[PDB]
Amino acid sequence: VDVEKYAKVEKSIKSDDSQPTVWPAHDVKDDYVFECEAGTQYQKTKLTILQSLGDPLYYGKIQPCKAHSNWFIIGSKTDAERVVNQYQELVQNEAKCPVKMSHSSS
Q: What is the SS3 assignment for 22? A: strand
User: In this structure, what is the dihedral angle of CA atoms 105, 45, 40, 93, given to the nearest 10 degrees?
Assistant: 100
This entry's atomic model was obtained through: cryo-EM
E strand or H helix that includes residue 101: strand 100-105
Resolution of the determined structure in angstroms stands at 19.1
CA distance 62 to 45: 7
Burial readout 22-48 (b: 16 or more C-beta within 10 A, e: otherwise): eebeeeeebbbebbbeeeeeeebebbb
DSSP state, 10?
A: P
Three-state secondary structure of 30-74:
EEEEEECCCCCCCCCEEEEEEECCCCCCEEECCCECCCCCCCEEE
Side-chain half-sphere CA neighbours of 69 within 13 A:
0
If phi > 0 it is left, if psi is from -120 to 50 it is alpha, else beta; for residue 78 that is alpha
| 47, 62 contact by CB (below 8 A) | yes
How crowded is residue 55: how many other Cβ atoms within 10 Å of its Cβ? 12
DSSP state, 9?
A: P
Residue type, 56: P
